[model samples]
Target: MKRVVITGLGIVSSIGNNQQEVLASLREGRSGITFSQELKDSGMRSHVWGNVKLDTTGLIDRKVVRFMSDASIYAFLSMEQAIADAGLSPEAYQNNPRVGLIAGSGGGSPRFQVFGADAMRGPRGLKAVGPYVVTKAMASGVSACLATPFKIHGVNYSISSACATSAHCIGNAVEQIQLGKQDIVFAGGGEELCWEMACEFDAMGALSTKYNDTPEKASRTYDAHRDGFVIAGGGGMVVVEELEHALARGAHIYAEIVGYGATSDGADMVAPSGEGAVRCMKMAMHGVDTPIDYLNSHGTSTPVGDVKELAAIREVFGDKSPAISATKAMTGHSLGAAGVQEAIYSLLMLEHGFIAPSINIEELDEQAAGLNIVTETTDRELTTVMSNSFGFGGTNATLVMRKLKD
Candidate 1:
């Protein structure tokens, strides 16, 4: 089996755009959650959001913009950054069909979906609706958009597992490399903060509604008074390459992906099960003896989710309490893009020797009573790290990584 290592990473989120900027936000505990009156205008009770800031002019080809939605736009920005950060030139992979990619894109863009439907019903009829809407609005837009320009001809596709979308992408990419099928793969997911998703989540009572006036305090993960997660959108990508390939290219390795465990609860749709989470975690920990120095928890600030995830952690590691924190409290919840976003946060902490804080926890939930939930940024050398992501369909994915040492 070949070893898989992360050579590069990139992110575009509410907190920051690049690696260094995101690192500063993580170190300073800067919160990006803010009130979105647009959401309110859309009749959403949860008005707080992780309103992402982006500008693609001149950065991306103007013609290709027609093929991209908000999600793919973010994914392209992050993917390009990671590829460049890895010192990989398009020409290097232009002839190599073994370089693959897996990116996640949500359902057709709400903007296009609404416009196309309305246009089709208008007086102009078919003429009102233009071409190229499908590719721009399709669920697989992110992956296809990336593969075309990057010339990744091998095993290119997208994965959609709700919030675990990007995590599954990374997990499967590792397996592909381990099986000697692909030498290098770009894996990640991106999402849009359109009012459609927010409205739906608000309708399902899955968004924080009480903190409309205090957006930063809205996503209070593990807090006793926490209500629900704040809706956010962003994307990130990581360069996952075989150890030998990265070494040959002299790529800067951040960490080695030791294990990737994926499992389904086999029951429930919206509710998550701790038993499945524990089993999945242990699976990822297989053959790994080093204690997890820090854990990037999937601690979305929902009343039941925060407690349930913490319970799963306690059951898995017991007395060996890892320094756990939820980055969502700062960036809100980006859903599909969350897994990669949090994974990048974990890797950054490993590189910088610091643990980002899980702010807004005024009073920790009694359920998280004895857990060492990090509320302040702490600088400490970490050897091993774990990242967990649980989605709505009872799907769970966990990733274990160790800092490159030897």
Candidate 2:
């Protein structure tokens, strides 16, 4: 069995587009959510929207951009950074069948789906949109678009399990590397902002409606007063490579992929009991010791989900055992990209020797009162870090990473 390690990490989130900027935001507990009048005008009760604003310029070829969506573009940018950080040249992956990419998104760009449809319905017809609408709207194309630019051929596919999309992708990548099916792979996911998705969530009453004026404080994870979660979109990618492969290339190591846990509730579609979450954590920690230094929780601040996840954490690590914080409190929830984003947060804490703050916790929910939730940016020597991501359909994933040491 081959060991898996993270060779590089990249992020393009509402907090920041690069690793350094995101790290600073994580340390400062800055919020990336903002009010969107468009959402309000669209009659969406949830006026707060979390989205990335970047200048791509010449980063990608013009021919490719036409068929790509914002989600795919984010993936390209993130993958570009990760590949460079890992010291992998274009030719390396282009020629090496062992190099592959496993990535995906919650869905394709909804904006283009509407645009393409409207254009077809209008007088412009198919001429208004070229032959790219199908490619841009298909969820699977996110990975294909990303792979085409870099020529990654091995085990390239997309996973769409809502928020757990990237977590599953990362876990699958580890399995592939362990089974010797691939030497290196990009594991993560991306998403693009669309009022359509938010409007739907609003109908489900799953979004924070009262935070239009206070967008920054809207996503209050585990807080008593939090109305609901804000929807965010972006990309986060991590380079997973075989331990020996990374060492042979003299690549910089971020953390070791010690364990991965994935499971299904087999019950409710919306509500998640702590049962499966506990089993998932136990599977990840099968032979590992207790006392996890820090955990990046999937604390979306939903009134019900947060409490259930907390119960699971209490069962696994005991009450207030490992210091926990919700990076989502700052960046909102990025859906398919969230798992990877939170995983990056965990790895960042392990590499930088600090735990991120769970900001906006003005009033804590009584259920989460006894936990050791970090509310301030504090320095700590973290060895083992875990990140949890659970999707809407009771899909759960847990990732355990240990600081790389000789």
Candidate 3:
């Protein structure tokens, strides 16, 4: 069995564009929560979100802009960063046909939303809704758009595990590398803050209705006063390789992609199960060699979800759940991208020898009574850390990352 390591990472989140900026923000517990004024104009309840503050120009060519949507543009930006960060030039692609592209593009096509809504508004033309609509709107299109430019031809697929989507994609891609299905893989997810997804979240009553006036306090993870999660849109991509392949080529490894455990709650579509979360984390630990000393929790600031997740942690770790931290309280939840965003923070946590702190956890929810959640203080010496993602439809996935070994 070959070892897997993360060679490169590209991320676009509300906190920052790359790992360094994200690291600084994570260290300081800077909250990127902001009110979605656009949603307000759409007549939807205003909510907070972690939106990127960068120019999207020079990403998609002017001619090709009409064919792509905002989500694809975001995906392209993230993939561009990841490939550049990996230092893979055109020469590298000449010999690396085994590089796979995997992504979870939740709410990928914004044009479809426009087409559907626009057609409903009287005599608008329906010229854009073609067979290509399904293909382009599919989650896999995020990677397909990426592979074409690089000439990559390997095991390419999209994982649609809802919020756990990206983690599942990366986890399954690691299995492909271990089995020699591919030598290197790019895996992650991107989503647009589309009106459809927003409407769904709003109808389900899963959105934060309290922070419209106080956007900064929108995502209060594990807080007794917490109401719901803030919706964020962005994408993150990472290059994964077999450990020997990375070491043989002398690539800079971000972290060891040791164990990926995936499971489900078998209960509700939107509600989370604490036992399933426990199972996922324990399974990952079962695959790894050392004890997990830190945990990057999926604390989306929803009261029930946060409490249930903490219960799952206490049930699994008992007395050693590591210093649990909810970084999303700082960046807001990035839907499908949330998995990789948090995972990226876990990798940085290992690299910097400091655990990212969770802000706004002042009064631990009564449900999270006994968990060792990290708060306020930043610096800590931790070795192994686990990142957990539980999504809608009861999906649960966990990935474990460790410091590089000799």
Highest-scoring model, lDDT: 1
For candidate 2, list the clashing residue pairs, or say none. Answer: none
- Sort all candidates by TM-score, best to worst: 1, 2, 3
- When 1 and 3 are scored with TM-score, the better candidate is 1
Model 1: lDDT of residue 194 = 83
Evaluated against the true structure, the overall lDDT of model 2 is 0.87
User: In terms of TM-score, which candidate is stronger, 2 or 3?
Assistant: 2
Please give each candidate's TM-score. 0.98, 0.97, 0.94
Q: Write the per-residue lDDT of candidate 2 for residues 70-133, one digit (tens) a residue.
A: 8888888898888888898777778578988889988677888898888999988889977888
Tens digits of lDDT, candidate 3, 243-347: 877887888888887788899999988889788898888888886778888888888888689878888888887887578888888888787788877788888
Candidate 1: tens digits of C-alpha lDDT, residues 166-274: 9999999999999999999999989988887678888999999988998889999999999999988989999999999999989999999997899998878987878
Better of 1 and 2 by TM-score: 1
| Candidate 3 Cα errors over 4 Å, as ranges | 63-66, 120-124, 128-136
lDDT of 3: 0.79
Model 1 residue runs over 4 Å out of place are none
